[PDB]
A paper describes a structure:
To investigate the performance of the microscope in practical biological structure determination, we chose eleven macromolecular specimens with different sizes and symmetries to show that the capabilities of the instrument span the full range of molecular structures for which the single-particle [name] method is ideally suited. We determined eleven structures, with three having four identical molecular subunits, three having twelve identical subunits, and one structure each having 1, 5, 6, 24, and 60 subunits. When compared to the range of atomic structures determined by [name] in the PDB in recent years, we can therefore conclude that the system overall works well for nearly all specimens amenable to single-particle [name]. It is notable that all the structures were obtained with a single day of data collection where the number of one megapixel images in each case was between 350 and 500, equivalent to 20-30 images from the current generation of 16-megapixel direct electron detectors in use at 300 keV.
Two of the others were essentially at Nyquist resolution (catalase and [name] at 3.4 Å), with only PaaZ and the 70S ribosome at 0.9 Nyquist.
Numbering used by the authors:
A (entry chain A), B (entry chain A), C (entry chain A): 1 to 154, 189 to 469
The structure:
Amino acid sequence: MSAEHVLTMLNEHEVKFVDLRFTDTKGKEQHVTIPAHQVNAEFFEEGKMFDGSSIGGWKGINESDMVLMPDASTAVIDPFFADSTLIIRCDILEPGTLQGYDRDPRSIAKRAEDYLRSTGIADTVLFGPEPEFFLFDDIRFGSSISGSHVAIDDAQDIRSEMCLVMEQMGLVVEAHHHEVATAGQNEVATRFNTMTKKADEIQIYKYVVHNVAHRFGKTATFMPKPMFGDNGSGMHCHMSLSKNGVNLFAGDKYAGLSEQALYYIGGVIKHAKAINALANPTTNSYKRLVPGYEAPVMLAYSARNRSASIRIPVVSSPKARRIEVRFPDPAANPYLCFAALLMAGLDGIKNKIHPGEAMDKNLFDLPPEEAKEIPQVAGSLEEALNELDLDREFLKAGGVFTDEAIDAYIALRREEDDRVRMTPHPVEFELYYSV
Amino acid sequence: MSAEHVLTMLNEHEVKFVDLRFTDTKGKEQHVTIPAHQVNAEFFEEGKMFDGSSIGGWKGINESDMVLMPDASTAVIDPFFADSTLIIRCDILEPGTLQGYDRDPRSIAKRAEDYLRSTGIADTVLFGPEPEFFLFDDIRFGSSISGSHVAIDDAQDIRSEMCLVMEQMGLVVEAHHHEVATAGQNEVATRFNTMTKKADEIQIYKYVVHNVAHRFGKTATFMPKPMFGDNGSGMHCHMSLSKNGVNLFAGDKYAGLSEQALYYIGGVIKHAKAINALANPTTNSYKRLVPGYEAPVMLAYSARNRSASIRIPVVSSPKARRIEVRFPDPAANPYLCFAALLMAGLDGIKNKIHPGEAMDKNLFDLPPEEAKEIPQVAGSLEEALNELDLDREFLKAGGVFTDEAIDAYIALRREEDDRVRMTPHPVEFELYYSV
Amino acid sequence: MSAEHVLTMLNEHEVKFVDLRFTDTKGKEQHVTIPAHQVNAEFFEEGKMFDGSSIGGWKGINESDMVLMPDASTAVIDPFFADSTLIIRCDILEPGTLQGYDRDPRSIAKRAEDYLRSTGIADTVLFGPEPEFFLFDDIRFGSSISGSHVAIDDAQDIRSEMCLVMEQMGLVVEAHHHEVATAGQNEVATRFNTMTKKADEIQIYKYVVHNVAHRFGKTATFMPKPMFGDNGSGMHCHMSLSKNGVNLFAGDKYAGLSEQALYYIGGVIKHAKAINALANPTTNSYKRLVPGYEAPVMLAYSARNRSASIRIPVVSSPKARRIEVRFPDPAANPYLCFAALLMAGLDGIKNKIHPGEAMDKNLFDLPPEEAKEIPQVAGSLEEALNELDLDREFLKAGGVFTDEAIDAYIALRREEDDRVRMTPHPVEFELYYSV
């Protein structure tokens, strides 16, 4: 899809504004809106000059502006704006070299896919995530010097019209279930795409969910554990690799899974804590990866066991043979999370890393003199960030991740880890106020 | 002081009730009240049969009762009860052997002192703690399934009458300062005693503080960090060793400190994380031992530096030469905390452990490529409990701590660590709800 | 009715979503919604992969997914959804064998009918239930640690539009009476169908009632005893058996009733407590089956007496000769309740079980030295579940009910029986608080 069709779309829909959207390293979606008449043919080869100081982690105060280069293939009409707006996802480029910024999540995802095609291991990667969210009637939260509080006050109509708006915005939806047990927990499923396209679709997904909830007077959250005791919000990721239109994950070994796939799982298992730094980036994220019950915490693979973090779904077709990793959560930055998973898998394939043996077991149900034995995902955000700091190498292969970018990411996550670490918690008053 | 004087006190003061008090492994103070006429001469050689199942960590459901044996030297009139009551601190004894219970904090403290006298290193130990508390006007806290909250609403009269009641109850008070900067933070200082006597005095201290506050319509808390940004509540512990009436900590080395004292500091530094499991037993306790600013976090000794955890106070007298360790907090169980510090020091003396060199530096003010280098106290309650689980040996010397007692303590602290770990925190809503 | 007509209906009505509905062992109605464009011709021969772990009683955590196979003959447009939806009832199938799941109520009902046709006793069974509900203006209920409460605040328009919506959804309605005496108690009658069709109609009935009430700002309940003193909600079930288009219940004996029918009644009477475990599955259900007054509690048959649980309605036609059992309540799972009644009747026919003599008496009005003598329905849910545990055999004939399925059902009902048993009741405070 080219720029000419975008200008045609501008004239056709009577678009008044164009909303250029990009993503911070935090995963938050930033935007700049320009009038539709400022979009010309030339606009698609110079982009828009932006002040790259405001965003955290990015260019500092002395190193100056960046370039917003739109991707014309990502153009879509915004359903929620009163004045007809066209959304275009943009890359952040260095104004001189006019190349992808080192600290740009979208550029990093594109680099990861390019490295995939470069290494010759496969031609494309298919990512299918399953982001789950919570719908609440109301919420009030706050934290002053003299205490803290949160209060959460808990339909088909909301989800069905979410699905309709998501299909307006180019997503292909394929199920809309409520979770049977958990109050407010909903999940819309969607069709698999390539990494960067699917990450863009995850940004559109979250946008639609948030805005459609506000229309119905609700509040949606993609926060991995918003409520005690009730099951957390996850984002299970199905990976496949394809070369010239055939799966590399289809073979003859355990559950019809290929040798290349087994090394992919090995690579994911080995670096899973460095991955956890990117896939599980919040401190809330480790209240659902808790040691013990109902946790996708055990770093092993099994088609039967559902206490293993890595599942091998059973499909009556060699053309759909994938691995599902279940530890990532919807608070992840889709670009960085997906790039991390792909690079871990490629490092596993490159180094012939063998995952071991399938745990057709009942984990959790194992006595805790063997619960200790199995590799586990990171126990806290500090542990994950430390493991990332020590295990940078697999992310730097092919220059996808810069040392500088990893450093900036770690620092930006630590400034939030520390704020959580040093605020007093209400449960600590219940337990220790009298003591 | 004998039983006969206690019966004399019963007749003299017209005591109606006798309150037998003991301490859980949590540090909470349990009591059984008997009528004054049930106290006979025979009562001081059989004690009182107690059901030892209710308390957590102690004897289970199949192993049955314990014995409350009063210590007649700990008798004191309760100032707060309308019906004249005599408080007596009791030990928990096994009904058969009539020996100190293995999971009894007071018995463990007595065993630690007995082992001290057995090893011949010194004759007695002098402990001077400095417990600090917070006075608030009001507080409301709570944690349901649908959220959590805390709200804290912030005088000379209260402290001065606290000091008067503490001197009624046999404490020798020696200062009553308000903390200049921190709202509500107060501190009453007291004279040094031996380990077990001082631990009993710390229990009386906390009792008096709590009850006198309630009289004035206030709420006192010994919780290490009840409020954000404002400095935490600590309990700095001054240790001295004496043999036949002379300090073993008085010598000719750094700041007039003896060789035996240097090995004591070495032993405290080496095992400081295993100690932290007992001296810093709450998860709140590590919000004041935070990496960085104003933390007694650096495991080194210095007479000048006040970022070192271990201080060497300067006194114009060889008869008062002590080491002050500043990481313990007032939520500690005084018996277990003091026993741990003494045993670490004795293991340091026994194994000739050299602490190294005095850090006449400015810590925190050090660049964080050397902040990393220095030994640190435990970063979280999990780390401290794991280090305790691995470093049991120094506590088991002379059979002071049983493996069974250490196991029960660790399990009982973990069941609270886990409850804190899996509840959602209000600050995590502020940071990640939208994300 | 085939799949082709369903795809035609999708195009005709401009259906946007398809709602696949199934029933737990609890009787609760679960659903998965897919977009209308995901329904293809192939979708009706593979179904939809579902995670069968969430539902209680069904496949555990290690045994993995199930298949939703739609029944194209059960397709109907949902009247309450804003986005035009097509409801299809689905069976749960094992993904391998592609056969009916053992713990699936709908599959069990189909198996019961298949066993009926297999044994050659009859060709089809006609079930006519009479589910009654309560309409309230408002209700508030709750149960915390510090008490419990319920408060119920009590038209032709509601029922008449209920009847209209039920006829939209393929039910044939045939009366809409309010109960003369009981506040809020309403009843819509419907035409007889076969077992599985009628159970599907009972699910549609309950759905329509609940949703139409919410439209009018009311609350409907199918709970057997929502209010003290006032008569409970029942679901009287009329059974008939047909072979090649003639009743087997039409004959020459008592009230024109056939020999086969008499053994059917005998079989129902013998196993009525095992049946009560399925037809009366709640603890509330035995507050309307109370020993004494106005209870369909007496296990005997009579055309005249209305204190007998089994009635023989008088009809001026041999083509309508049925037996009405009056103990079942609308909280029952229609599939399991109906399967249980049919299997008890078939075991009665197979074993020539004679019911005895008609009780043309006045029961309740009998002195309680003969009230004791007559067989009674179960007195509590525990008794019913114990009798079911002992009397499994009649349900296992022809493999309709698995031992595993019965075990799972019993366990799932017991976890609710126990929660009711151990919560303190307000009336027990009225009677025994002072005592």
